[PDB]
Write a protein that binds this ligand. Structure first.
Ligand SMILES: *[C@@H]1O[C@H](CO)[C@@H](O)[C@H](O)[C@H]1NC(C)=O
Ligand SMILES: *[C@@H]1O[C@H](CO)[C@@H](O)[C@H](O)[C@H]1NC(C)=O
Lengths: 38, 22
């Protein structure tokens, strides 16, 4: 049987932050990954 | 007319072609 090899998912993680002087809330952006692998 | 997995990530542009058209 013939198998495809697809590399496991990966990508950079960037943090969205308003300036700390305003607040400490943070939202995280996972680059180029479907919202299932998370 | 105008026409891999090694850590090479292609970031998307901020203005999609749609807003550029506007
Ligand atoms: C930033 O925080 C400092 C507190 O050390 C305060 O003195 C300053 O006014 C703040 N700046 C703004 C723009 O909120
Ligand atoms: C993520 O996977 C789902 C399959 O449940 C698919 O419908 C969706 O298009 C995928 N999105 C991306 C960005 O791969």
């Amino acid at each position: 049987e013939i198998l495809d090899i697809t590399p496991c998912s990966f990508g950079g993680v960037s943090v969205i932050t308003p300036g700390t002087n305003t607040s400490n809330q943070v939202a995280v952006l996972y680059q180029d990954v479907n919202c299932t692998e998370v | 007319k105008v026409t891999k997995f090694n850590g090479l990530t292609v970031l998307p542009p901020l203005l999609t072609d749609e807003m550029i058209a506007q």
